[PDB]
Design an enzyme around this catalytic site. Structure first.
Site, mmCIF file in Angstrom:
data_model
loop_
_atom_site.group_PDB
_atom_site.id
_atom_site.type_symbol
_atom_site.label_atom_id
_atom_site.label_comp_id
_atom_site.label_asym_id
_atom_site.label_seq_id
_atom_site.Cartn_x
_atom_site.Cartn_y
_atom_site.Cartn_z
ATOM 1 N N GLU A 1 -4.313 3.241 -11.117
ATOM 2 C CA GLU A 1 -5.122 2.024 -10.965
ATOM 3 C C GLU A 1 -6.216 1.965 -12.040
ATOM 4 O O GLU A 1 -6.437 0.928 -12.649
ATOM 5 C CB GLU A 1 -5.781 1.988 -9.601
ATOM 6 C CG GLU A 1 -4.808 1.957 -8.430
ATOM 7 C CD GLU A 1 -5.562 2.032 -7.130
ATOM 8 O OE1 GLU A 1 -6.124 0.993 -6.719
ATOM 9 O OE2 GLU A 1 -5.629 3.133 -6.544
ATOM 10 N N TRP B 1 -9.270 6.020 -1.248
ATOM 11 C CA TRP B 1 -9.559 6.644 -2.529
ATOM 12 C C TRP B 1 -8.530 6.181 -3.565
ATOM 13 O O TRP B 1 -7.463 5.707 -3.220
ATOM 14 C CB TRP B 1 -9.615 8.189 -2.418
ATOM 15 C CG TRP B 1 -8.376 8.823 -1.834
ATOM 16 C CD1 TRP B 1 -7.165 9.034 -2.469
ATOM 17 C CD2 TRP B 1 -8.220 9.321 -0.504
ATOM 18 N NE1 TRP B 1 -6.276 9.630 -1.606
ATOM 19 C CE2 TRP B 1 -6.892 9.813 -0.393
ATOM 20 C CE3 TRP B 1 -9.068 9.386 0.619
ATOM 21 C CZ2 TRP B 1 -6.400 10.385 0.795
ATOM 22 C CZ3 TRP B 1 -8.583 9.953 1.793
ATOM 23 C CH2 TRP B 1 -7.257 10.447 1.870
ATOM 24 N N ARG C 1 -0.135 4.784 2.654
ATOM 25 C CA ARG C 1 -0.063 4.635 4.111
ATOM 26 C C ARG C 1 0.234 5.893 4.940
ATOM 27 O O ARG C 1 0.200 5.825 6.163
ATOM 28 C CB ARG C 1 0.907 3.513 4.486
ATOM 29 C CG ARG C 1 0.348 2.123 4.239
ATOM 30 C CD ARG C 1 1.349 1.060 4.649
ATOM 31 N NE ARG C 1 2.351 0.800 3.605
ATOM 32 C CZ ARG C 1 3.485 0.126 3.785
ATOM 33 N NH1 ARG C 1 3.786 -0.359 4.986
ATOM 34 N NH2 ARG C 1 4.315 -0.065 2.759
ATOM 35 N N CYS D 1 0.804 -1.232 0.000
ATOM 36 C CA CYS D 1 0.000 0.000 0.000
ATOM 37 C C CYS D 1 0.835 1.279 0.000
ATOM 38 O O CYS D 1 1.584 1.559 0.946
ATOM 39 C CB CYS D 1 -1.016 0.014 1.165
ATOM 40 S SG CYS D 1 -2.043 1.485 1.192
HETATM 41 C C1 HEM Z 1 -6.549 6.556 1.494
HETATM 42 C C2 HEM Z 1 -6.142 6.375 0.230
HETATM 43 C C3 HEM Z 1 -5.465 5.070 -0.275
HETATM 44 C C4 HEM Z 1 -4.706 5.003 -1.369
HETATM 45 C C5 HEM Z 1 -4.383 6.215 -2.286
HETATM 46 C C6 HEM Z 1 -4.233 3.643 -1.545
HETATM 47 C C7 HEM Z 1 -3.401 3.159 -2.571
HETATM 48 C C8 HEM Z 1 -3.150 1.822 -2.859
HETATM 49 C C9 HEM Z 1 -2.637 1.236 -4.097
HETATM 50 C C10 HEM Z 1 -2.257 1.998 -5.396
HETATM 51 C C11 HEM Z 1 -2.563 -0.084 -3.918
HETATM 52 C C12 HEM Z 1 -2.114 -1.141 -4.933
HETATM 53 C C13 HEM Z 1 -3.443 -1.455 -5.643
HETATM 54 C C14 HEM Z 1 -3.330 -2.383 -6.825
HETATM 55 O O1 HEM Z 1 -2.375 -2.271 -7.635
HETATM 56 O O2 HEM Z 1 -4.225 -3.262 -6.957
HETATM 57 C C15 HEM Z 1 -3.021 -0.393 -2.581
HETATM 58 C C16 HEM Z 1 -3.060 -1.647 -2.014
HETATM 59 C C17 HEM Z 1 -3.500 -1.956 -0.743
HETATM 60 N N1 HEM Z 1 -4.076 -1.075 0.180
HETATM 61 FE FE1 HEM Z 1 -4.070 0.988 0.015
HETATM 62 N N2 HEM Z 1 -4.726 2.907 -0.474
HETATM 63 C C18 HEM Z 1 -5.499 3.751 0.319
HETATM 64 C C19 HEM Z 1 -6.187 3.368 1.463
HETATM 65 C C20 HEM Z 1 -6.154 2.125 2.078
HETATM 66 C C21 HEM Z 1 -6.907 1.693 3.250
HETATM 67 C C22 HEM Z 1 -7.919 2.562 4.010
HETATM 68 C C23 HEM Z 1 -6.584 0.421 3.518
HETATM 69 C C24 HEM Z 1 -7.106 -0.494 4.657
HETATM 70 C C25 HEM Z 1 -7.585 0.038 5.798
HETATM 71 C C26 HEM Z 1 -5.606 0.013 2.534
HETATM 72 C C27 HEM Z 1 -4.997 -1.215 2.469
HETATM 73 C C28 HEM Z 1 -4.407 -1.766 1.360
HETATM 74 C C29 HEM Z 1 -4.050 -3.159 1.237
HETATM 75 C C30 HEM Z 1 -4.205 -4.318 2.268
HETATM 76 C C31 HEM Z 1 -3.434 -3.273 -0.154
HETATM 77 C C32 HEM Z 1 -2.903 -4.575 -0.791
HETATM 78 C C33 HEM Z 1 -4.150 -5.173 -1.425
HETATM 79 C C34 HEM Z 1 -3.874 -6.489 -2.087
HETATM 80 O O3 HEM Z 1 -2.842 -7.162 -1.773
HETATM 81 O O4 HEM Z 1 -4.739 -6.842 -2.932
HETATM 82 N N3 HEM Z 1 -5.385 1.059 1.672
HETATM 83 N N4 HEM Z 1 -3.363 0.790 -1.974
HETATM 84 C C1 LIG Z 2 -4.763 -12.589 -6.948
HETATM 85 C C2 LIG Z 2 -4.750 -11.341 -6.109
HETATM 86 C C3 LIG Z 2 -3.935 -11.244 -4.966
HETATM 87 C C4 LIG Z 2 -3.942 -10.071 -4.210
HETATM 88 N N1 LIG Z 2 -3.167 -9.925 -3.092
HETATM 89 N N2 LIG Z 2 -4.738 -9.054 -4.609
HETATM 90 C C5 LIG Z 2 -5.544 -9.127 -5.698
HETATM 91 C C6 LIG Z 2 -6.425 -7.961 -6.072
HETATM 92 C C7 LIG Z 2 -5.622 -6.671 -6.071
HETATM 93 C C8 LIG Z 2 -6.578 -5.530 -6.361
HETATM 94 C C9 LIG Z 2 -7.207 -5.479 -7.610
HETATM 95 N N3 LIG Z 2 -8.048 -4.465 -7.898
HETATM 96 C C10 LIG Z 2 -8.307 -3.487 -7.004
HETATM 97 C C11 LIG Z 2 -7.700 -3.487 -5.742
HETATM 98 C C12 LIG Z 2 -8.046 -2.366 -4.788
HETATM 99 C C13 LIG Z 2 -6.826 -1.497 -4.561
HETATM 100 C C14 LIG Z 2 -7.072 -0.301 -3.663
HETATM 101 C C15 LIG Z 2 -7.571 -0.429 -2.370
HETATM 102 C C16 LIG Z 2 -7.747 0.700 -1.591
HETATM 103 C C17 LIG Z 2 -8.309 0.568 -0.201
HETATM 104 C C18 LIG Z 2 -7.433 1.950 -2.114
HETATM 105 C C19 LIG Z 2 -6.935 2.031 -3.418
HETATM 106 N N4 LIG Z 2 -6.592 3.218 -3.978
HETATM 107 N N5 LIG Z 2 -6.764 0.914 -4.147
HETATM 108 C C20 LIG Z 2 -6.825 -4.523 -5.410
HETATM 109 C C21 LIG Z 2 -5.563 -10.274 -6.484
#
Ligand code: HEM
Ligand SMILES: Cc1cc(N)nc(CCc2cncc(CCc3cc(C)cc(N)n3)c2)c1
Ligand code: HEM
Ligand SMILES: Cc1cc(N)nc(CCc2cncc(CCc3cc(C)cc(N)n3)c2)c1
Ligand SMILES: C[C@H](O)[C@H](O)[C@H]1CNc2nc(N)[nH]c(=O)c2N1
Ligand SMILES: C[C@H](O)[C@H](O)[C@H]1CNc2nc(N)[nH]c(=O)c2N1
Ligand SMILES: [Zn+2]
Lengths: 404, 403
Positions: free
Chosen positions: B284, B279, B110, B107
């Site tokens: 993305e 957001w 953060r 993420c």
């Molecule tokens: C507030 C604005 C936020 C932004 C701009 C943001 C941005 C991002 C981005 C760009 C990714 C990679 C997404 C992808 O390529 O699929 C990501 C992943 C992630 N975010 Fe954040 N995020 C935000 C808030 C949060 C919040 C509120 C949480 C949880 C409370 C969170 C938890 C996570 C987690 C666990 C991942 C990894 C997801 C996965 O492995 O599929 N994020 N975030």
């Molecule tokens: C196989 C697999 C594994 C894994 N760890 N995650 C995925 C899905 C990853 C994924 C795909 N589309 C969308 C998201 C959401 C990403 C996301 C989440 C939040 C909270 C904020 C933000 N800006 N972006 C995440 C797939």
């Protein structure tokens, strides 16, 4: 079920298992506790078992595994080590090992070309002047008036209690970086130290943004000697843009030949401290890193001002737009000048083909995902979606610390 | 022992000491790095994870070793010893949720970790109630476009029974309809979940941007189907600041990125349904969702509108169209007044976060391959920053699809 790393392509859904990683006889920097994959630098009987292994690799590759020629070579190697503490590669063994080192290099996206490498043997070289002649020959052959050809020149290996052959320059061709009165740098900031070293060893410096550095060449147990490359041998490409007429007025240029000169080539425990190698550029190296890195030429703002972009806010994407045009400028200018170059799309497509070839030939391919994915447009290229396993195979190229 | 971590643009070095706190092994060994893999494949244990977590909680409120600390450790001992499990106090849940976000290595957002609205939905006993909770979350997080980070936490896993689960991978997602010609209408990533929704009684639309219904599962029950009220799902039509034909492509995206399939683990307890939202970062949508070849794959369409030479990779038509699609996303969100961050702003703030975490905790786990944006990587400061990846708890954890 297979007890080897499972490797997936997320674009196509296809799966392989890497069995080649079992051949790895050298630890990287990762543990189960923490991944250190993104670090640029990880920090007697031994020689013999490394030598034995390389010779096995050689006889496997020529399909004479188990033959008495194989066993006799094995016997010949251990008898050499038995009485001299070292041994020497046959000519065809050196050729094999050099190609295998390139093949094994996790950070190289151009490995589809690995089997086509001119290996110049220079293990007879005995002076810095002779190193110069050898290097000039390499540059001439490699450059080939723009029709670039992969090549490596191999100088004599490390000897016990004898100093090393070393090329002090990190590349055979690189621009000077002149530290200025006001703290700034004219030319390439990456090369401030080597520039200062060249001057300390008697080079009369220029005052340009693109001054080709001279070579600093060290023969065993001697101070390094200085050699200027004759300008007719260093092919350069002036940069222009296909539609932006003003781009040529910027006076930007780059050299044709990417030639690494500071890496250690290791083969069967033997160490070749001077073994410069060259290929042709992928355009992102010049257009994105060399020209746009903040700590390099840093031209992004200048180009965006010329393009009339709003440089005062991030969300105009002025950096992205300017970087794209600079990259297109690198490609168009090389193409126009008839100098070999490959864009990041073709290079990565061809690397996916290489992954598939190696899957069949060896059961895997060591690769450094962070280095294989290009520095612009990453997910637009097929390698972005391809999982990669990274491990050290030998023969290998190795970073070695600067000799100063 | 402690890894040196270097920024290559600036020459600065830190040492990561936080990593010694990791209790769970990742996929790498000294023989080979598997850091690019998307997923790698009693009472005494739970008690020590619980003690440790409670220790973290009291430390964070600076009440370490106090009477309330000791008596809370005793409460947990007593509950586990008698029942095989325990329950968190609301404030602890709140702490754990923020910390799981903090600890999330993939993420880039953060910097925001301390600002998270936490809805305690542990008093949920039906798919119906889950649906109501999800609707409050969405309405709250969306806030007419001024997005606010939120998490809703459904009842934890229990030894004697099935999980509360949200079948959808995100709360808001577009349908993908497999066609006779074997092509897909809509979003190819969601063909399977679209098919489940139809099988469980949904009347499907036939567009490219049909918002899917929710399939919610209370323990050991068949999942139930719930259509999101269209007024709750904020969408943004996409147009371009200078290219007027772009709007004609009829492209759109949803405001709220809300992950609904991850497991939240705190102090050894596991929350199988704990949807969270923030957001978007513009790449993305602009790069992955619209430009990935196995997604809407619009690159060639746009490049042709822009009248670029598509015959050759060397014209960089892909790179040109990708940038314009990203710009259109940013412009459209700003025009519609919905929160969004571009990848330059996001990564700069992430660098600040690294610096903050270094002072606060002596490190920050980060997955370089996920932090670096999918266009213009080396043009962002994170590209030149070495990173160290490891699993800290509390954590978000991937879990397999429930079907
Ligand atoms: C507030 C604005 C936020 C932004 C701009 C943001 C941005 C991002 C981005 C760009 C990714 C990679 C997404 C992808 O390529 O699929 C990501 C992943 C992630 N975010 Fe954040 N995020 C935000 C808030 C949060 C919040 C509120 C949480 C949880 C409370 C969170 C938890 C996570 C987690 C666990 C991942 C990894 C997801 C996965 O492995 O599929 N994020 N975030
Ligand atoms: C196989 C697999 C594994 C894994 N760890 N995650 C995925 C899905 C990853 C994924 C795909 N589309 C969308 C998201 C959401 C990403 C996301 C989440 C939040 C909270 C904020 C933000 N800006 N972006 C995440 C797939
Ligand atoms: C034929 C054309 C070639 C292309 C297009 C190519 C491409 C590349 C690229 C893009 C990199 C990353 C460089 C960076 O970001 O600085 C690289 C690294 C590397 N290449 Fe290749 N290469 C080619 C030929 C060769 C040859 C002939 C060799 C050796 C025989 C070689 C060995 C290596 C090694 C060892 C690295 C790692 C360098 C380091 O760690 O600093 N390449 N190559
Ligand atoms: C600290 C450090 C470690 C390391 N392993 N490499 C380096 C230098 C990386 C580097 C920088 N500019 C240029 C190169 C050479 C790249 C290169 C080499 C060849 C043969 C072909 C081609 N297209 N490109 C390599 C530095
Ligand atoms: C910190 C990070 O490992 C470093 O900046 C790497 C990332 N990927 C790279 N990839 C290539 N090809 N060349 C590089 O110099 C780098 N730099
Ligand atoms: C194989 C590779 O690890 C995979 O494509 C990753 C790369 N980096 C990523 N980075 C982000 N933010 N999101 C992703 O889905 C991915 N995909
Ligand atoms: Zn690793």
């Amino acid at each position: 079920g297979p007890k080897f790393p499972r490797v997936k392509n997320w674009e196509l859904g296809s799966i392989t298992y890497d069995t080649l990683c079992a051949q790895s006889q050298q630890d990287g920097p990762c543990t189960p506790r923490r991944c250190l994959g993104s670090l640029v630098l990880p920090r007697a009987e031994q020689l013999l078992s490394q030598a034995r292994d390389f010779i096995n690799q050689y006889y496997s590759s020529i399909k004479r595994s188990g033959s008495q020629a194989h066993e006799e070579r094995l016997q010949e190697v251990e008898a050499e080590v038995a009485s001299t503490g070292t041994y020497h590669l046959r000519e065809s063994e050196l050729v094999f090992g050099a190609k295998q080192a390139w093949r094994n290099a996790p950070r190289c996206v151009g490995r589809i070309q690995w089997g086509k490498l001119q290996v110049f043997d220079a293990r007879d070289c005995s002076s810095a002047q002779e190193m110069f002649t050898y290097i000039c020959n390499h540059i001439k052959y490699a450059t080939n008036r723009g029709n670039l050809r992969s090549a490596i020149t191999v100088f004599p290996q490390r000897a016990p209690g004898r100093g090393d052959f070393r090329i002090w320059n990190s590349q055979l061709v690189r621009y000077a970086g002149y530290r200025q009165q006001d703290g700034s740098v004219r030319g390439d900031p990456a090369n401030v130290e080597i520039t200062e070293l060249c001057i300390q060893h008697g080079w009369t410096p220029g005052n340009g943004r693109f001054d080709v550095l001279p070579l600093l060449l060290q023969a065993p147990d001697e101070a390094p000697e200085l050699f200027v490359l004759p300008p007719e041998l260093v092919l350069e490409v002036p940069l222009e843009h296909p539609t932006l007429e003003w781009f040529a007025a910027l006076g930007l240029r780059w050299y044709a030949l990417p030639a690494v000169s500071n890496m250690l080539l290791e083969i069967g425990g033997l160490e070749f401290s001077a073994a410069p190698f060259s290929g042709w550029y992928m355009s992102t190296e010049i257009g994105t890193r060399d020209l746009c890195d903040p700590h390099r030429y840093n031209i992004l703002e200048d180009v965006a001002v010329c393009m009339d972009l709003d440089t005062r806010t991030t969300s105009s994407l002025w950096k992205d737009k300017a970087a794209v045009e600079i990259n297109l400028a690198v490609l168009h200018s090389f193409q126009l000048a008839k100098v070999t170059i490959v864009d990041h799309h073709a290079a990565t497509v061809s690397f996916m083909k290489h992954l598939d070839n190696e899957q069949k030939a060896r059961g895997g391919c060591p690769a450094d995902w962070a280095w294989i994915v290009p520095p612009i447009s990453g997910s637009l290229t097929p390698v972005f979606h391809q999982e990669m396993v990274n491990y050290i195979l030998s023969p290998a190229f190795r970073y070695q610390p600067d000799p100063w």
